[PDB]
Scaffold this motif. Sequence first.
Motif, PDB file in Angstrom:
ATOM      1  N   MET A  12      43.568  48.125  51.340  1.00  0.00           N
ATOM      2  CA  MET A  12      42.366  47.618  50.693  1.00  0.00           C
ATOM      3  C   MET A  12      42.496  46.146  50.334  1.00  0.00           C
ATOM      4  SD  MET A  12      40.664  50.593  48.344  1.00  0.00           S
ATOM      5  CE  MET A  12      42.101  50.769  47.296  1.00  0.00           C
ATOM      6  N   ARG A  13      43.712  45.677  50.048  1.00  0.00           N
ATOM      7  CA  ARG A  13      43.918  44.248  49.843  1.00  0.00           C
ATOM      8  C   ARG A  13      43.607  43.467  51.111  1.00  0.00           C
ATOM      9  NH1 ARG A  13      44.544  39.517  50.362  1.00  0.00           N
ATOM     10  NH2 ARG A  13      45.940  38.175  49.142  1.00  0.00           N
ATOM     11  N   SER A  14      44.019  43.991  52.268  1.00  0.00           N
ATOM     12  CA  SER A  14      43.762  43.314  53.533  1.00  0.00           C
ATOM     13  C   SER A  14      42.277  43.195  53.834  1.00  0.00           C
ATOM     14  CB  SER A  14      44.466  44.047  54.674  1.00  0.00           C
ATOM     15  OG  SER A  14      45.865  44.086  54.465  1.00  0.00           O
ATOM     16  N   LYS A  15      41.447  44.069  53.260  1.00  0.00           N
ATOM     17  CA  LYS A  15      40.007  43.952  53.445  1.00  0.00           C
ATOM     18  C   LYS A  15      39.417  42.814  52.625  1.00  0.00           C
ATOM     19  CE  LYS A  15      40.515  47.717  55.811  1.00  0.00           C
ATOM     20  NZ  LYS A  15      41.952  47.864  55.458  1.00  0.00           N
ATOM     21  N   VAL A  16      40.171  42.271  51.673  1.00  0.00           N
ATOM     22  CA  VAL A  16      39.695  41.192  50.814  1.00  0.00           C
ATOM     23  C   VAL A  16      40.152  39.881  51.446  1.00  0.00           C
ATOM     24  CG1 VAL A  16      39.462  40.402  48.453  1.00  0.00           C
ATOM     25  CG2 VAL A  16      40.043  42.779  48.911  1.00  0.00           C
ATOM     26  N   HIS A  17      39.272  39.264  52.223  1.00  0.00           N
ATOM     27  CA  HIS A  17      39.583  38.005  52.885  1.00  0.00           C
ATOM     28  C   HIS A  17      38.294  37.200  53.008  1.00  0.00           C
ATOM     29  CE1 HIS A  17      38.857  40.932  56.241  1.00  0.00           C
ATOM     30  NE2 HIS A  17      38.063  39.952  56.629  1.00  0.00           N
ATOM     31  N   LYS A  18      38.303  36.201  53.885  1.00  0.00           N
ATOM     32  CA  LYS A  18      37.242  35.209  53.974  1.00  0.00           C
ATOM     33  C   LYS A  18      36.102  35.621  54.902  1.00  0.00           C
ATOM     34  CE  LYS A  18      38.091  31.490  56.087  1.00  0.00           C
ATOM     35  NZ  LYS A  18      38.986  30.387  56.534  1.00  0.00           N
ATOM     36  N   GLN A  19      36.211  36.759  55.578  1.00  0.00           N
ATOM     37  CA  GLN A  19      35.181  37.216  56.502  1.00  0.00           C
ATOM     38  C   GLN A  19      34.293  38.307  55.922  1.00  0.00           C
ATOM     39  OE1 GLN A  19      34.434  36.076  59.531  1.00  0.00           O
ATOM     40  NE2 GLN A  19      36.140  34.660  59.878  1.00  0.00           N
ATOM     41  N   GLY A  20      34.526  38.719  54.678  1.00  0.00           N
ATOM     42  CA  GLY A  20      33.785  39.832  54.117  1.00  0.00           C
ATOM     43  C   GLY A  20      32.297  39.556  54.034  1.00  0.00           C
ATOM     44  N   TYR A  21      31.526  40.647  54.021  1.00  0.00           N
ATOM     45  CA  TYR A  21      30.070  40.537  54.062  1.00  0.00           C
ATOM     46  C   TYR A  21      29.533  39.796  52.843  1.00  0.00           C
ATOM     47  CZ  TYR A  21      25.220  42.003  54.738  1.00  0.00           C
ATOM     48  OH  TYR A  21      23.857  42.029  54.921  1.00  0.00           O
ATOM     49  N   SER A  22      29.972  40.192  51.648  1.00  0.00           N
ATOM     50  CA  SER A  22      29.489  39.539  50.438  1.00  0.00           C
ATOM     51  C   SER A  22      29.960  38.095  50.369  1.00  0.00           C
ATOM     52  CB  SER A  22      29.945  40.316  49.206  1.00  0.00           C
ATOM     53  OG  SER A  22      31.345  40.522  49.227  1.00  0.00           O
ATOM     54  N   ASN A  23      31.198  37.830  50.794  1.00  0.00           N
ATOM     55  CA  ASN A  23      31.702  36.462  50.773  1.00  0.00           C
ATOM     56  C   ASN A  23      30.924  35.571  51.732  1.00  0.00           C
ATOM     57  OD1 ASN A  23      33.552  38.065  49.388  1.00  0.00           O
ATOM     58  ND2 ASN A  23      35.275  36.731  49.912  1.00  0.00           N
ATOM     59  N   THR A  24      30.610  36.076  52.927  1.00  0.00           N
ATOM     60  CA  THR A  24      29.793  35.301  53.856  1.00  0.00           C
ATOM     61  C   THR A  24      28.412  35.032  53.280  1.00  0.00           C
ATOM     62  OG1 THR A  24      29.253  37.376  54.977  1.00  0.00           O
ATOM     63  CG2 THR A  24      30.994  36.019  55.937  1.00  0.00           C
ATOM     64  N   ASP A  70      34.559  44.824  57.454  1.00  0.00           N
ATOM     65  CA  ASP A  70      34.809  43.577  56.745  1.00  0.00           C
ATOM     66  C   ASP A  70      34.826  42.389  57.698  1.00  0.00           C
ATOM     67  OD1 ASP A  70      37.060  44.302  58.071  1.00  0.00           O
ATOM     68  OD2 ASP A  70      38.446  43.939  56.408  1.00  0.00           O
ATOM     69  N   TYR A  76      43.864  34.102  53.528  1.00  0.00           N
ATOM     70  CA  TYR A  76      44.026  35.112  52.493  1.00  0.00           C
ATOM     71  C   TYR A  76      44.104  34.530  51.090  1.00  0.00           C
ATOM     72  CZ  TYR A  76      44.734  39.117  55.569  1.00  0.00           C
ATOM     73  OH  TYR A  76      44.559  40.139  56.464  1.00  0.00           O
ATOM     74  N   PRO A 103      41.439  44.062  45.320  1.00  0.00           N
ATOM     75  CA  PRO A 103      40.353  44.992  45.659  1.00  0.00           C
ATOM     76  C   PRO A 103      39.489  45.276  44.437  1.00  0.00           C
ATOM     77  CG  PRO A 103      42.532  45.844  46.286  1.00  0.00           C
ATOM     78  CD  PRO A 103      42.749  44.727  45.328  1.00  0.00           C
ATOM     79  N   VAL A 115      26.168  42.621  46.596  1.00  0.00           N
ATOM     80  CA  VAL A 115      26.258  41.564  47.601  1.00  0.00           C
ATOM     81  C   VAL A 115      25.941  40.196  47.008  1.00  0.00           C
ATOM     82  CG1 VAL A 115      26.004  42.912  49.705  1.00  0.00           C
ATOM     83  CG2 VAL A 115      23.996  42.401  48.342  1.00  0.00           C
ATOM     84  N   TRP A 172      53.123  37.711  50.509  1.00  0.00           N
ATOM     85  CA  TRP A 172      52.610  38.620  51.526  1.00  0.00           C
ATOM     86  C   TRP A 172      51.359  38.083  52.198  1.00  0.00           C
ATOM     87  CZ3 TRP A 172      47.996  40.835  52.440  1.00  0.00           C
ATOM     88  CH2 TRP A 172      47.946  41.854  53.393  1.00  0.00           C
TER      89      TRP A 172
END
Lengths: 276, 288, 452, 239, 319, 357
Positions: free
Chosen positions: B14-26, C67, E25, E33, E101, F11
């Motif tokens: 789930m941490r890996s899903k938190v990055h710069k390409q996420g829907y809300s971030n975009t 994502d 990252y 999360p 969102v 990491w």
Amino acid sequence: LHAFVRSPHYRTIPSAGPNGIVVNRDMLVHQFRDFYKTLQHCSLVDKVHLMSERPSVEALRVADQMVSIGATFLEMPLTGMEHRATEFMESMRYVRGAGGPSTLASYLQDTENCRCNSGDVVCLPNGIAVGHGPRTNAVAHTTLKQLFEVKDDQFSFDVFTLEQEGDAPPLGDYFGFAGSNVLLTWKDEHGLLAVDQYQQKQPHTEMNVVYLEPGCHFLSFYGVDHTIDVLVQKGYERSMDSIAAAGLNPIPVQWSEMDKLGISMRAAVLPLKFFK
Amino acid sequence: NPFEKVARGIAFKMRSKVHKQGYSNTVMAQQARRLSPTGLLAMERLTELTALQQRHQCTFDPALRSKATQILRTLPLLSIDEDPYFTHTQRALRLAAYFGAVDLPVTYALINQHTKNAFMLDAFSMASFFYTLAKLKHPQTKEIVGILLPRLREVAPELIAREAVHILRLLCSIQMADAQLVKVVTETVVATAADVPLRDARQCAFILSETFPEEAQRILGAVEHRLCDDIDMNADANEVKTTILDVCRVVSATCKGPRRLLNSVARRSMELLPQLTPLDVAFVLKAF
Amino acid sequence: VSHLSARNIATEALQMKKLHQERGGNPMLAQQARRVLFATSIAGQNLDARSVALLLNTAVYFGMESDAKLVRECIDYCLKNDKLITVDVLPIVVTACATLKSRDAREVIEMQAQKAARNAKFLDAKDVTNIISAFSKTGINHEKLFAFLSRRVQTLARVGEFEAAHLVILANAFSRLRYRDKFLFGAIARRAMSLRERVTVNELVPLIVAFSKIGLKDPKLSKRFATKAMEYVDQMNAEQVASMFMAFAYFGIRYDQLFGVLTNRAVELIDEFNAQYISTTLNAFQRIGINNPELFDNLAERALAVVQDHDARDISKTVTALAHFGLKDEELFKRLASHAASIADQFDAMGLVNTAHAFARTNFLQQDMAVALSERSVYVCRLLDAGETRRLLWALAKFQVRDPKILTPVFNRCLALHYDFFADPTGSEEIEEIFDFYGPNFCPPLYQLYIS
Amino acid sequence: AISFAIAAFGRVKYLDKKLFDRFTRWILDHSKDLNAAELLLTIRGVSRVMLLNDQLYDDLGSKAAEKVKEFPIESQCVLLSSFGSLGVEHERLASRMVSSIAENREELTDATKAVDVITSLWSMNYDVEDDKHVAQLADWVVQRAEELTDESIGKLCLVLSDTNWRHVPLVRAIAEQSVRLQGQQSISPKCCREVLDVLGTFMIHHQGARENLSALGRSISKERIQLSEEEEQHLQLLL
Amino acid sequence: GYGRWNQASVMQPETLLDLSQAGFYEGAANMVPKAFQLLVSDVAIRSRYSKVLQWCCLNMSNLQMDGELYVDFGKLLLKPSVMRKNRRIVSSYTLQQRLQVNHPYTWVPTLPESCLSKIQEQFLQPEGFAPIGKGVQLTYSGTIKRSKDQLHVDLDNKGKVLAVNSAWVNLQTAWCTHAKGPDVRLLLRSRPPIRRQDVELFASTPIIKLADDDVADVLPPEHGQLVYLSEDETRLFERVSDRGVTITVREVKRQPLIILRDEEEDPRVEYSLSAHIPANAAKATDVRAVGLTAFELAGRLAGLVAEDFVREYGCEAKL
Amino acid sequence: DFSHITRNTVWGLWNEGNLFSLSVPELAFFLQEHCRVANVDPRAKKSALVRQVEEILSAEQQASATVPQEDNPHAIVVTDYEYGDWGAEPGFESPRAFQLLHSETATDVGIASIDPSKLPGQSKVKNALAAIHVAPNDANKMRFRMAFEWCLMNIWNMNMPGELNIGAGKALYYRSVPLWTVQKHLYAQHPYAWFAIASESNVAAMESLAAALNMSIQQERTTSYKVTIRREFFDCELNGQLKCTMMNKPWDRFFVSHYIRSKMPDLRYVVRARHPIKKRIADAYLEVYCCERVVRKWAKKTATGVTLQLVETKRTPLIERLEYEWIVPLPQQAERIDIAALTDELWEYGNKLAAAL
């Protein structure tokens, strides 16, 4: 290399088929599961596909929808065949599930008054032997000549018009071909006419001719690849000896009770050639 | 143990899903780019007077300056922190500079935009700002430079030589050059002496010669042999004249000069004698 | 101004996936693949459907989800362009959009199901297994499609056309799909018996598991598979042994010779047991009723070796299996209790009640475990039926707990289901014990309902 | 230090998006003064990292079209391969480049490289059925069709089949070379299958190859449905 | 380019692309999360608030982080653009996705005055427990905007900075909305790591110049822009229920002085309940009773201020 | 060297490449503290430290974050025998239609409008929204009018005649049964039964409602025979002399909604159309299920003008219960009748029917 066969409908088998001879329903569906195994273990075809069951027993007469004359298929002209249109509209789907589109035979279906039938035109190493008889008109032969014929030293391809009498069965039923220059034929006036008309048309071929007693159904196709295998109907050991003496391994298939139905093995398997 | 291993794996998944390409971030990074209507009006006025700048250069019709003055006099300019990179604002400052609009309030508004937010000015933006504000003889350049200098001492290491020349010229004209920007800029210009426009090296050496003789000496020594080769093998008489003249000026200012360069400048001065105005010969002998 | 070529990226990622799943799977290669795939983007290019399901399959393999932008641009163009997807590409797309939690990863599945139903008739042997295994993952609930696919399976397997590896795939997929049909599974068993000796043990055991997990009430197949398992018991490892134990227990019939040779196999493989499938090899014994103590002692001995890393549900299963004819080996029991106290993480309400009940009925009371379980009991009592609430209450009483914050919620719940609380005869005796401790003072309405 | 940097990145496949964007912007800016040995060194570099810069490729192709004589033959082949790997079509480049290889045909090390040129010229969606320049290389392959190996025939069968090329002598040469390759027991079933496919597609019999090639050519395209020993003996009982 | 530029034909096949996407990252909003809750009043919702909170604490543990549980009371005002085509009914799932969102909600943490009748002057007084607070502690609270991220600073009334650290990142945000009383907001917050150089730097340079009554910003323009300053009056109370559970209640009367947006203009008063969840709380030790306890206490406090919230101060047309 | 180094940071670097952004002291501290290395060599330069850190992390992963898309057939898995919180799901925002309605649940949050002018700040905005658990009655009523609009358009586009009938009866949910999960289960499996049961003692009450709404008897107590035959269901309405009057195709429901109230018999709404039958087969029988039905029908005109027919029927299969229903034909696309107010009135009349039994 794609052989389409269809399993018979158990409930709608007409007992005492159109010859006055009774038929055993409980044994047809037992011999069919052996015919399928032999077909998929005979090195003659690549993949065998089992079409779904249909009520009409005549729907089992596959290999009348179209003919494989290379990478382009030709579906036969619509004449007195609309009464099975559904199984001519569904079967096609079975083709597109593994193969693909083609010329669609718009050159054939749309060519004015036209008549033809599969099992009447047989492909040969460098020719197309068309059986001019009671099933295919000469105009169809002219269209085939316009389409598949190429005339040059190495761009050579011929179309052979084979005349036959009105009572003659389809050409592919008695005048067949097999690998390594062997020309199986039925030993009757039809076979005599076939070999006569073949010798009068480009006799330079010099290919072996083997005789079979009439009434022995056989399935053998030129195919893309060379092979020595003939599907000979059981109960004709003389024919088996005749073919095996020529260097062709014979594969016997039980076909007695399907014969009473009146449908040949050539019309029990629809072969296609699919290329990428 | 399966639960703890799976829990660690799930936490990292789930941490890996938190990055710069996420829907809300975009969607957020696309919503911030949207500008309020006053910004759209400012952009419209900017587009309007850009054409006026492009057209004034061919006919020089008067009263067009009045048109630009009115168009930018009440220019909304409201663009704070909607473009972190100072475009559409440095451009506006440049356009106002072209018309001499140093006294109009929006000009000091732009300057205040630069000074108040003097923490989002990278190397290119700060260098471009310093290139202007010198074409504008602003009454209060002193305090602007004083406020910007603590940032300049941190942005200096990533300054290209062509902009370092203007920076040093500005900080030397107003006597605000220091021993902290100069050291780092000379370190950069000495490090990349392998391939640097000799024009820039000579300009920096001359400009720093008056107040920082040692740094000018180091710069001149760094690009010594390339300068000698330019003096010897070049064919442009005017360029070699200017080069020998200004290197002579550098040597006179720092009261020192490597002999390897002096031999070559002497030889080429002797060869290319007639073109030299007596001032040039006087300067050469002054340097010697 | 610089767009990576998606087609060549796909052909690269296929090789990367092959390397990652054949070489061992070092995380460096996974990170490299994710780095290259993140920057990949479908754009005004004209990728064909064959080389779009690859950029989606590999991505989802490497951890990409909705994502990323690649997935969001590959899940789309499957909503809009559905004709391009043929029956060869369909299984890949369907098994890709199955772990993805998005809401287009569920419209795509339904749109594909509206296509596979119409073409469930025109499918050969391989493609039917691929499509069924694809649709098994998504957990879709379209019965017409499943009926048509079962029809096609029966038609194709009337004449032998399935190798002895697609039977395992098909049975597993249908069993996981929870689709009860006697015709289809009878046909699959017939075909499996036709290909004698081609179904090796590694391909035999999963077939038994899949058939046992479907609920087929019949003695036929459970009789036929017995001899095959008896002959194949020679060359199977501990995992398959325990799984077959559980499958034969769930079939519900008792075979003396097969179970005897299974015990003789297990006693030779006692060393390997890692206690994650000791739970099954014990719970199967408990369920069937067989009570042979020869291997219980060896399992108890091996439970000491791995006690520090029993899974949470494993403790419940093993201890409730140690209820029936528990040999009361306190040496292991005390450490199991201590670990259960230490493993007090996310548990199962049924797991909690069964753990406490098995701890109390064996009469080996301990303090720390009881405290931890009583503390956890509050958050799960709102999801208990009358019977399990009664079991939990009696377990608490045998633990001698008088904390009002723990007993008030369970008493409220048991009052909410009083009619079901009192109507179970098998718990009546237990009732005469619970009020034996709390007395009439505790929950007067409950005592008043109890007296009547 | 740009062409060198590109060719040192485009040789170990370590594209950096921002750095390459800046490199390509610089190149597109000062694109009028890149000599030969750079266009090669940068085209073979920015294509082993798969960037579809429309303007960059459309300019480098034209610049290499103007400078054709300076490139050696191997450089021309590598340039065509680099453009064809991605699929970035450039009709002018190929038209001005294949003439040089046709004229200097005799210098190729063997006949494999001619089929490589034809294949990587097809991938660029350049119609090989066009002017005789492709036909010269095809005939050159025909004359010395003994150096072709399995991979070369495999690459040639695809281009022959896909574009509907009626070249008969090339097909006969393929057939004879495949026959002798099988005679040396150094051919692969996929090559045999493709050869039989192209032969059948073009209505050419060539009974010499079908006899000693088909047996190899069916193990790739025969579904060997596994049959048990009891089922095998039952089938033997059948026939 | 030179050398052997005509032998460019040998290239090892074991070359797979290895793009580097540095700067991906990292960040403050891209490090944990997160979780969102739209719990609506009028049981079975304290099960969602149990499960999500437990998983969030477990995730905080597995990432080797620590955080604290912050609960307060206020009033949400969702932006008018959340609904479409003027439909007053919407799925509780579609709304929870709508708000997740854009985050189109305005949050105003406030309570009416004269609400201290219940707190410290009712049975809530024992609930408030010991007032270990040292009396009102005049403090200024400010926040600064760096080049990349933001910092939060607390400065004592007369002295240098007493606290300077990174901005808050709240994993789980729950809008436990009520009908007529003030809404209750629950949070599980954490602090991103801060460079010692930055804290010592902002300690060295004085932030503001509070000469006489008026105050001004004297932050050097090379460090940030002062965006929010407010005078605070703070009080504290602590409870210890034999489990190390320090549910601390804190009252702050903040008077916003340095303002950026019109949202924060008038003086505000805010209560806040808090706990502490270290890097070991999620391990073994129960970390759900804290959440449920805080939820129940916050609900009771909201109930005890139901009547006066809709009094002459404010109004709630929740129908 | 400082506290800003964290396992999360080292990491997010390792997974990103770019591990060389950390100086030598940073990586030495990371190896010493987190990796439990005895002592890093001070002589070691950047590259050796990067290699050691990457090796330690690679061994540390000790798990698989890859979900395989293949289907390994040698996997013996005996283990087997939603609220949308953890993210923002991208790209969001034979009964043909069945949604469950209830009088208590209303799992659709309501929305109100309030002006926080007196709140601190905010004294410029005069409208703002909030959240509330909306009353199930009104929320289900709004969902019902929306669903009726949908089911009316779905049959208008087919230009097929149809009608809406409301049966008074109970529903038995099997043991195999949030509310969305129940909706999906009922739309997938149909694990329920519907029983149309009415008490005879209420007859005198229902006639009273005929006076309450001013309803006139349009059909007296009439005995008909509802007989469905197989050939396809074909429903013939035989007279008292076993002569067919009208033959109809099966009832193809389009909209189904079972309002399961807490008390009293439930209400089953059914919008359904009868497919027109070709007269070639209809004429055959005009000259497996069999029931005798004694029917009484009251009729009235609603405030909106639609025909409202209250139908009581004593049903008795022969190949047996009292039943009450409302009947309203589906309005055509040429009538332009209001939908919302008519739907409210129909819902209120259904509530009256439920409360009167």
